[PDB]
Amino acid sequence: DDKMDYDFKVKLSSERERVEDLFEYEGCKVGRGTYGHVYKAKRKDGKDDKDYALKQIEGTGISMSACREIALLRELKHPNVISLQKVFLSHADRKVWLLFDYAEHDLWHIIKFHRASLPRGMVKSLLYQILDGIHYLHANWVLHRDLKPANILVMGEGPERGRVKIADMGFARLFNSPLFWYRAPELLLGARHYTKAIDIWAIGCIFAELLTSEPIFHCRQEPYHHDQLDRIFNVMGFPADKDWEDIKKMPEHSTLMKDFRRNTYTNCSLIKYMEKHKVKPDSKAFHLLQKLLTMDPIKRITSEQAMQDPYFLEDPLPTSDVFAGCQIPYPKREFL
Amino acid sequence: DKAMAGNFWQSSHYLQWILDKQDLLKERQKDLKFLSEEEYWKLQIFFTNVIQALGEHLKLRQQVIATATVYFKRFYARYSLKSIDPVLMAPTCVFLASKVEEFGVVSNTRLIAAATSVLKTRFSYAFPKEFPYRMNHILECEFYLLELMDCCLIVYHPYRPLLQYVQDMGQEDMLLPLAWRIVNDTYRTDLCLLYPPFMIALACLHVACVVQQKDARQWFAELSVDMEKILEIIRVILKLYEQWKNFDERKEMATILSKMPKPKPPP
């Protein structure tokens, strides 16, 4: 600026850490999306040989999405939630870079490796840490809103070996407004707000996918999404009036009634679904899953109540290291 | 409920942005070469009124105006008034604070129109010339502001806890309007850099009770908190209202603004 103090301007300019000086990353692009692009980085100085994730946030300046992600990540501190180590503000091009500890694995790749053909200690431990991390967020009135296997990172070799790191939270949603395999039925019937319950449904889906290796509500490419609802009912059955009294309050309930019939899904239930995928319906795992995958969101258990479930008191106990001291067979991330 | 509501004791506000008074006044001596102590507090009052005026124009909530007011104070806590023109910083602070909320978006043209309109209609006693900055200047300022604050954006204010206390007394009708305005008035002072929000809220509520002549001693006694520090906060509040009496913002601010140190140009 021609009317900012010059001594102040050059001083800050002299002292400003620039991302290109501190870190080596050119050509190490590791993820790409409509929320900024991520790189596997190492420090140029030999201070430590650990890997970091550098995310360049899309667009110039500080957008609402940029703002709120920076705002919240700067406050949040919990072992199961991804940690902002540093924010670089590059003055020349007006790009923002966020530095994180690098997560070598994620549940999307872990599950896909197994599907290309999970120990039960590992499944329980994954679920527990997911629940621990979401519960933290929820206690601080932070919703995730885009929970799915690709957003559940898992740390590799290093001092946090096998710890879950929840990532990629939907920090900006205009007015908290949603207005599909992991989306709760209320969103599909036009729920006007994100809620703790919607995240929990998502965790139930992930737990079912961890037990079976198959997305429980897998569906082809399509607010209201008919075929995704058709799949929910093929697995769960069609909800009775008694199971979800407030379903009539949903904006798309009349559409649901026109499009679907109860007797279509008379054979269908979660018990029968899970039996096909070799999971016992009198196991603590199943009874927990069923509580997470409750259709009425006011009948869905909370993350805190899930952590208290006796499933986590049953042999085997959840472990901090999800890999339980065993060798990690899963391949290291491919560059994009 | 709002994001990070119960997290104050582990927050960046508490861990980094509750400053020592000794450290504050030592960095202020830079600007005290040009302005007196009296003129420095008078300037702080002025720019609090400017940030309130901007917020009221953009129809933002009091809590967003507060966050903006704090961002401003944090900046000039560390840096001189010469470093970035406070006429540019004020709306830049309002702009950044509005974006911290996910409900509604303040647009570019609407920011510049708001700054321009407010200085012209409400502060023409201080500013003869039109608001000279444009959006490129705001966007540049935003970056410097964000750097100094160490990306600490989430800010806690006395409003939330105030509300809880008046509801606890069962005297929301009598005391809340008055206590609330006194909390707004505390932003005319350094209190928000020196004490946690809840202690400011208690102090405000005490002044409200004394002004309205309700006996709150048995309620105040039943609170587990350092009463010395509350009394310290009441003294600043009491002094603020005697500063208010003795100060004619409109008759004095043009001259005081001329005394502010100007930036160095480029070579």
UniProtKB/Swiss-Prot annotation, chain A:
Record field: catalytic activity: L-seryl-[protein] + ATP = O-phospho-L-seryl-[protein] + ADP + H(+); L-threonyl-[protein] + ATP = O-phospho-L-threonyl-[protein] + ADP + H(+); [DNA-directed RNA polymerase] + ATP = phospho-[DNA-directed RNA polymerase] + ADP + H(+)
Cellular compartment(s): Nucleus
Result for mutant: residue 30 to L: In IDDHBA; decreased protein kinase activity
Consequence when changing residue 100 to L: In IDDHBA; uncertain significance
Effect of residue 65 to L: In IDDHBA; decreased protein kinase activity
Effect caused by changing residue 168 to A: Abrogates kinase activity and TFIIH-dependent transcriptional repression
Binding site for ATP: 30-38, 55
Annotated spans, Interaction with CCNC: 4-18
Limits of the Protein kinase domain: 24-312
Annotated keywords: Activator, ATP-binding, Autism spectrum disorder, Disease variant, Intellectual disability, Kinase, Nucleotide-binding, Nucleus, Repressor, Serine/threonine-protein kinase, Transcription, Transcription regulation, Transferase
Result when mutating residue 32 to G: In IDDHBA; decreased protein kinase activity
Required co-factors: Mg(2+)
Chief localisation class: nucleus
EC number: 2.7.11.22, 2.7.11.23
GO cellular component: CKM complex; cyclin-dependent protein kinase holoenzyme complex; mediator complex; nucleolus; nucleoplasm; nucleus; protein-containing complex
Active site as annotated: 146
Gene Ontology molecular-function annotations: ATP binding; cyclin-dependent protein serine/threonine kinase activity; protein kinase activity; protein serine kinase activity; protein serine/threonine kinase activity; RNA polymerase II CTD heptapeptide repeat kinase activity
Enzyme class: transferase
Any one biological process term the GO annotation gives: positive regulation of transcription by RNA polymerase II
Summary of subunit composition and partner proteins: Component of the Mediator complex, which is composed of MED1, MED4, MED6, MED7, MED8, MED9, MED10, MED11, MED12, MED13, MED13L, MED14, MED15, MED16, MED17, MED18, MED19, MED20, MED21, MED22, MED23, MED24, MED25, MED26, MED27, MED29, MED30, MED31, CCNC, CDK8 and CDC2L6/CDK11. The MED12, MED13, CCNC and CDK8 subunits form a distinct module termed the CDK8 module. Mediator containing the CDK8 module is less active than Mediator lacking this module in supporting transcriptional activation.
Similarity comment: family membership: Belongs to the protein kinase superfamily. CMGC Ser/Thr protein kinase family. CDC2/CDKX subfamily.
Entry's disease: Intellectual developmental disorder with hypotonia and behavioral abnormalities: An autosomal dominant neurodevelopmental disorder with onset in infancy. IDDHBA is characterized by hypotonia, global developmental delay, learning disability, and behavioral abnormalities, such as autistic features and attention deficit-hyperactivity disorder. Additional variable features may include non-specific facial dysmorphism, congenital heart defects, ocular anomalies, and poor feeding.
Protein's name in the database: Cyclin-dependent kinase 8
From Swiss-Prot, chain B:
Compartment(s) of residence: Nucleus
Chief place where the protein resides: nucleus
GO MF terms, alphabetically ordered: cyclin-dependent protein serine/threonine kinase regulator activity; identical protein binding
GO cellular component assignments: CKM complex; cyclin-dependent protein kinase holoenzyme complex; mediator complex; nucleoplasm; nucleus
Domain Cyclin N-terminal: 49-147
Distribution of this protein across tissues and organs: Highest levels in pancreas. High levels in heart, liver, skeletal muscle and kidney. Low levels in brain.
Sorted UniProt keywords: Activator, Cyclin, Nucleus, Phosphoprotein, Repressor, Transcription, Transcription regulation
Transmembrane segments: none
Pfam families: Cyclin_C_2 (PF16899), Cyclin_N (PF00134)
Gene Ontology terms describing biological process: G0 to G1 transition; negative regulation of Notch signaling pathway; positive regulation of transcription by RNA polymerase II
InterPro entries: Cyclin-like_dom (IPR013763), Cyclin-like_sf (IPR036915), Cyclin/Ssn8 (IPR043198), Cyclin_C_2 (IPR031658), Cyclin_N (IPR006671)
Quaternary state and interactors: Component of the Mediator complex, which is composed of MED1, MED4, MED6, MED7, MED8, MED9, MED10, MED11, MED12, MED13, MED13L, MED14, MED15, MED16, MED17, MED18, MED19, MED20, MED21, MED22, MED23, MED24, MED25, MED26, MED27, MED29, MED30, MED31, CCNC, CDK8 and CDC2L6/CDK11. The MED12, MED13, CCNC and CDK8 subunits form a distinct module termed the CDK8 module. Mediator containing the CDK8 module is less active than Mediator lacking this module in supporting transcriptional activation.
Similarity remark: Belongs to the cyclin family. Cyclin C subfamily.
Function according to Swiss-Prot or TrEMBL: Component of the Mediator complex, a coactivator involved in regulated gene transcription of nearly all RNA polymerase II-dependent genes. Mediator functions as a bridge to convey information from gene-specific regulatory proteins to the basal RNA polymerase II transcription machinery. Mediator is recruited to promoters by direct interactions with regulatory proteins and serves as a scaffold for the assembly of a functional preinitiation complex with RNA polymerase II and the general transcription factors.
Protein name, entry field: Cyclin-C
Naturally occurring in which organism (per UniProt): Homo sapiens (Human)
